[PDB]
Design a protein around this ligand. Structure first.
Ligand SMILES: [Cl-]
Ligand SMILES: [Cl-]
Ligand SMILES: [Cl-]
Ligand SMILES: [Cl-]
Ligand SMILES: [Cl-]
Lengths: 164, 164
């Protein structure tokens, strides 16, 4: 399952720390997500990565109450406009649009997603790949503390809930 | 608008006639369509073309009572299994699965789709591209008659309704 913790951060400072850690810079993604309202605790969105030409349909189901564990179903599509039209024609309503510029860094089984989110602010998502959720969260927190982050820095809300 | 008329035919005979007309053979597609139940008169399916490695999500809205006029929204996806899983998780129920081998031929603005449909039989769809629905049907019928087809040969039912 998807395991991740989100932190409210100062972009410049944390970028410097992540790099000082030796994380490998993967790339920047300029994303635009169109969300469709589903019953709790499910999420549905069509994502367009404007600088890479990639588009995806993504479905998520929150598995915990801290918004740290998710089941994710994601696949690439060749027509994001068509995907958005499809969900509207199926009766789904647009929940909102999240636009962000994401800096991706990798360190072993940990992925850092440093996001500059339009109308929300700057956030860092620390993601880990693991078969055991508990061990995964332990890894995320060891990394977080190495970056000088604490529990008070955590942001439980989803990006679609954070945009003003 | 998609305009097409479907005919019940004898595969070998009509294939001969179509080639006799000088239609250009485009290719054969081994298709597997998984349909999801929508309220009338809408259709939703995920198609896999097993021999070409292509997959699509297709939505249609029947616009007439003879099932000859359709609004179609179709786009390529990279994961048909995921698309099928997605619709199931969104609450849609599988309506059925249509499997067929399609021979595609082209002649000007007309496309011939000769289908050998599992558990249904052999059918020929004659489609035309037009801005004027009526002129389109006129073109289809001139071609149909050139192939020796008549009104009694028409099959109005959709493939998802035809499979046993
Ligand atoms: Cl994400
Ligand atoms: Cl989020
Ligand atoms: Cl996100
Ligand atoms: Cl078709
Ligand atoms: Cl079809």
């Amino acid at each position: 399952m998807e395991i991740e913790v989100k932190f409210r951060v100062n972009f410049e400072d944390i970028k410097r720390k992540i790099e000082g850690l030796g994380a490998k810079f993967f790339g920047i993604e300029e994303q635009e997500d169109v969300y469709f309202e589903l019953p709790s605790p499910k999420l549905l969105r069509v994502r367009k990565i404007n600088n890479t030409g990639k588009s995806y349909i993504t479905y998520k189901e929150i598995l915990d109450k801290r918004n740290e564990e998710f089941y994710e179903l994601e696949f690439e599509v060749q027509d994001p406009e068509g995907a958005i039209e499809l969900f509207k024609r199926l009766g789904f309503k647009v929940q909102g649009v999240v636009k962000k510029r994401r800096w991706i860094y990798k360190l072993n089984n940990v992925t850092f997603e440093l996001n500059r989110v339009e109308k929300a602010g700057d956030f860092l998502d620390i993601e880990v790949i693991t078969s055991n959720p508990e061990e995964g969260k332990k890894i995320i927190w060891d990394v977080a503390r190495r970056l000088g982050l604490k529990e008070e820095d955590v942001e439980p809300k989803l990006y679609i809930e954070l945009i003003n």
